[PDB]
Amino acid sequence: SGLSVHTDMASVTKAMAAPESGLEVRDRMWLKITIPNAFLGSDVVDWLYHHVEGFPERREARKYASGLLKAGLIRHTVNKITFSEQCYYVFGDL
Amino acid sequence: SGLSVHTDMASVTKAMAAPESGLEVRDRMWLKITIPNAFLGSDVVDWLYHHVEGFPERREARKYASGLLKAGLIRHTVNKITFSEQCYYVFGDL
Amino acid sequence: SGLSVHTDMASVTKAMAAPESGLEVRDRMWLKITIPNAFLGSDVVDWLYHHVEGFPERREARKYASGLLKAGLIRHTVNKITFSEQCYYVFGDLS
Amino acid sequence: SGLSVHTDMASVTKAMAAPESGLEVRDRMWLKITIPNAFLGSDVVDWLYHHVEGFPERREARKYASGLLKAGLIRHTVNKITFSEQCYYVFGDL
Incomplete structure (x- = not known):
């Protein structure tokens, strides 16, 4: 009822901003970066366990991934x- | 079979890096950043269309969100x- | 000021449930589903715009994506x- | 550039669905459900630690909440x- 398209924009924004207004507000952001040939720690750990004997x-296999870093x-x-499986990595020099 | 714990570390890594190694790779990664009080464009659009008559x-409602930006x-x-619903936003000076 | 670990549990819950208690309470919920090989509408448009000439x-590319749906x-x-770039899709029968 | 607006639609989709096509895909999705009066487990634990003494x-505080469930x-x-801070809850019979 009380807000509509005739209210000034600035006031509607301050309403959306106020505590308990209804707006989902969280302390994070997720950004997508295009980095060709990246991989997860978990994918390195997998590859070593299944391709490297002993x-x-x-x-x-996770300790060995760790020594590679x-x-x-x-x-x-x-x-x-420190190494984590959930983080993204790329190859070094070689 | 041909790679084990006795193998040269750098040689094991250059095999993992080669084409067709089996290593799950891809071209995008996601980064989490701690930004206080950030919000999704889609939630702004949900809040407007739910609370602002007209x-x-x-x-x-998405076009109005566009105008706020x-x-x-x-x-x-x-x-x-340009505005998108998948991006993250913070409030300006109010 | 006067709720503690010695207060009745049901009374604490009631306090948290009252209007203006300050608990974040809202008409929504979000659910994580595991769906192998699901993709977002915007990634389909992007794929079509970059790989399909004309x-x-x-x-x-968007309208073509709607015609796939x-x-x-x-x-x-x-x-x-209706097609939306924000929703998740999977593939239909392709055999 | 082997694919155009002239190509068969089913053949274009089979292309897109092929291993290594480039289409960005994921094994998870997030869905919004409208549920009246729902709250996040981490918001309950925050509310207890700040407004309850001892x-x-x-x-x-996390343990008390798990007791509340x-x-x-x-x-x-x-x-x-079991109780978890990233799952959503509603009130019981009060």
Whole structure:
């Protein structure tokens, strides 16, 4: 009722902005970047477990993925120290 | 069979990197950024069409959201001209 | 100020349920479904605009995408009819 | 440029559906359901930690909330046993 297309734009925006207005407001944003030949930690861990003999289990395939990052043979896409499976990586020099 | 834990680390990585290695790759990644009080264009459009009388179809609500961006009352999170429902937005100076 | 871990649980819940309690309460919910090989309308238009010659502008790619939905070559994941770039689709029968 | 507006529609779609076509695809989707008076598990835990006395930290608030689901005071909107902060709930019989 109380707001319509005749209300000034600035006031409608302040209404949408006020606490408890109804608007979904969260403390994050997801941006899509086009980086050819990237991959997830989980895809590296998979590939090593299934293609490289001698791992007693998957957690050792994950430690090996981790040493590849330390060695700079894969690289983080934004600056991070520690390996995670959920993060995206690209290849180092080679 | 031909790769195991005894193999050269760099050689194992160059095999993973080759064409047709089986390594799941693709050309896009998603980054999460912590922006306080950010919101989706689609939710702005949901809020308007739900709370502001005078819109005959949802498209007039999207066009109004477009006008809010032109006016600087909402703002893009990254350098972009035109409005989209899939992008993330913050409020301007109010 | 005067609710604590010693208060009646049902009374706490009631306090949180009252008007103006400050709990975020809203007429919506969002659900994650696992659907292998699902794609967004906007990615279909993008694919068609970049790979199929003869689209003078991007809106013509959109209308073609709508004509895929209408012919059943792609399918909405819920009960809708009209094409939207924001919804998720899957492939129809292609055998 | 082997495909145009002249090509068979079914053949264009089979192209798009082929391994390595370039079409961006995913194994998850998000759906909006209109449900009156629904709230996020993390919003309940926040509301408890801020307005109820005697929680030395946030994990004790999370546990109380999980207790609230067990007693039937809040309820899951999809059949799930256990409590989780990213799932949606409604009020029970009050």
